Amino acid sequence: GEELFTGVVPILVELDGDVNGHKFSVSGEGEGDATYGKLTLKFICTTGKLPVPWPTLVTTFVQCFSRYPDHMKRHDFFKSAMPEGYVQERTIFFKDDGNYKTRAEVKFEGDTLVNRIELKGIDFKEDGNILGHKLEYNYNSNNVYIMADKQKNGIKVNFKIRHNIEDGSVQLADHYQQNTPIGDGPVLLPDNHYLSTQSALSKDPNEKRDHMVLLEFVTAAGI
C-alpha cells in the first residue's frame, strides 16, 4: 500500500452527477504526492455549465494521498486498501437545503490512481444557495474525523464543511462517510484521529470550459 505512494502518482477523477434532475459530468486530472500530503488537480465540466457551485464538489472529488506521520502509519486505512482499493460512500446534508449521496470507487488502474464517482442530489431549492449559485469560490480549512468501523472492516468518517455565502453568511454541509475495502485483502483499522486539510481554488486563465483548479494539503494528526 504505502509503497505505491512513495513518489508522485497521476490521478484521474470521473464523476457522473444528477442534482434535482440537472445532469452533468466532470473529469479531473493531476497528481498526488502523499509524502507531502499534496494534491494538484484541474477539473472540467465536460457537459457544459456545472449546475452546482464548484466548492460543493471538492470533498467528493482520494484520502490515500494524506500525509500520515511515520508514528501513525499503522492507522492509514486508505493506503492499506491499495491497490485493490476501497468504496467510499457519503450523504452530504446542506443545511436548509438538499442533500448529495455519493458512491465512489478509489483504486489503481495501472500507475494511475482513479476515483470514479456517482452523485445523486435531491430536494434542493431552485433558488437556494446551491442551485442558485450563491457560494463564494473559495474554501476553508477543517478537520476530518476518522473512526474505525470494525463491523464493516472499514472506517466511518464525519465532519462539517462551511461554505461561504456571497452575503457573508455560511452554508453548512454535514458529511457522513463510510469506507470499506474492495478486496477481501487485509487493511489497517485505525484508532480515532483526524485529517487536517487546506484547499485553495483557482482558475486556469486559458480555460474556456467551466472548470476548477485545486491545490490541497492534508496531514493526519491527533495521535
- In the chain, the domains with their CATH numbers are 1-223 (2.40.155.10)
Determine the Cα–Cα distance for residues 103 and 4; give it in Å rounded to an integer.
24
Q: Are 68 and 89 in contact (CB under 8 A)?
A: no
What is the distance, to the nearest Å, from the Cα of residue 219 to the centroid of all Cα atoms in its chain?
14
| The three cell numbers locating residue 23 | 445532469
**Residues linked to residue 108 through DSSP beta bridges, in sequence order:** 113
Determine the Cα–Cα distance for residues 197 and 140; give it in Å rounded to an integer.
9
Q: Are 45 and 62 in contact (CB under 8 A)?
A: no
Quote the Cα angle for 194-65-189, to 5°: 50
| The three cell numbers locating residue 82 | 491499495
3-state secondary structure of 188: coil
Q: Which of 52, 95, 104, 93 is nearest to 175 (CA)?
A: 93
Q: Which of 74, 43, 62, 86 is nearest to 180 (CA)?
A: 86
Determine the Cα–Cα distance for residues 187 and 152; give it in Å rounded to an integer.
11
Q: Are strands 170-181 and 112-122 parallel, antiparallel or unpaired?
A: unpaired
Neighbouring C-beta atoms of residue 22, cutoff 10 Å = 15
Q: Which of 155, 174, 135, 158 is nearest to 52 (CA)?
A: 135
For residue 69, is the peptide bond before it cis, meaning its omega torsion is within 30 degrees of 0? no
Neighbouring C-beta atoms of residue 40, cutoff 10 Å = 15
DSSP 165: B
Quote the Cα angle for 205-206-209, to 5°: 100
**Residues linked to residue 130 through DSSP beta bridges, in sequence order:** none
